[model samples]
Target: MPERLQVYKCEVCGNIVEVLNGGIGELVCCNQDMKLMSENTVDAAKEKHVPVIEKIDGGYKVKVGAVAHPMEEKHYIQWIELLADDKCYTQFLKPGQAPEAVFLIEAAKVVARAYCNIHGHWKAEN
Candidate 1:
């Protein structure tokens, strides 16, 4: 079954989906089952892919990476997502834009994630 906030990408078509509702059914695309994305929580030094979260006054500050991902035209972060207490907030970004996204909400039990065009996904328990 697909889990809440789980990201799945189709290998055949390169389509991406985020599960807002989960059930007993599995995610399938292009006549094949989709692969569940594994959250990456560590940066291996040479490439900092770990997203970092900070508590702000009215909400949370989600940084795409500890060292910040590149905002070049070729490689860049796509979006940032904040899953707070079963509720999800998404912030779309651009290639030339910074990767920091602010989700204005108050909640706990949070998880922050960032998706890169080249990098699969980076996550953090905020």
Candidate 2:
């Protein structure tokens, strides 16, 4: 079964889908089963895609990569998400805009994620 927030891609057509809420049936695409896209792990191309999470005064801030990803039209971050305080927050990005996101949540633990147009998914936790 598919889990919530997990992304799946069609192998043949490269079509992507994100699970908003999971269900019983299998996800199908291109006349075949969809393949789950893996999250980019820590230190594995961190300089390009890993989301850098930080705690702030009122909430938290997230920046893509240690040096920040490009905001070009062809290659840029599509969206950023924050999972904290049992809630999820998301911010969509436009081309030429900064790839940084901030959220308001007062929780002990938090997870940050970003989706890149070329790099797929990247995650960080704090």
Candidate 3:
């Protein structure tokens, strides 16, 4: 399997997997090996598909996109996550929900991540 916390996708079936715990062997689906997802890309237009992080009053706020992603049922943010203090905090979203999340923990290293139903995964570091 891939390293812990790495994300993998099955191109043929659109299946996504997160390496939560260390394991042996490669991950396979549809009789094919899974492809590891690349790090979040920088969008020159500063639109969507990037995790935008900010410092808030209590903790940090993570927005899925620079502007904001659509909240329709067909295309919406599925979740947002923060990795800090050796722990991970996550928020699950649904259709019509905004693509933002807040985490109340403070840590030395803060890494933000977000998932779009149609776009895949995104990440940002503090």
Model 2 lDDT, full chain set: 0.85
What is the TM-score of each predicted model, taking all chains together? 0.85, 0.86, 0.85
For each candidate in the order shown, give its overall lDDT on alpha carbons. 0.81, 0.85, 0.81
Error of 2 at 121 (Å): 0.8
Tell me which residue pairs clash in candidate 2: none
List the lowest-lDDT window of 10 residues for candidate 1: 41-50
Per-candidate Cα RMSD to the true structure, in Å, reads 2.3, 2.3, 2.2
lDDT over C-alpha atoms for residue 82 of model 3: 93
lDDT string for model 2 (1-126, tens) is: 898989888869878888888988999988999987778843445786889988898889899978889989989999999987658889999888888998887887998989886778888898
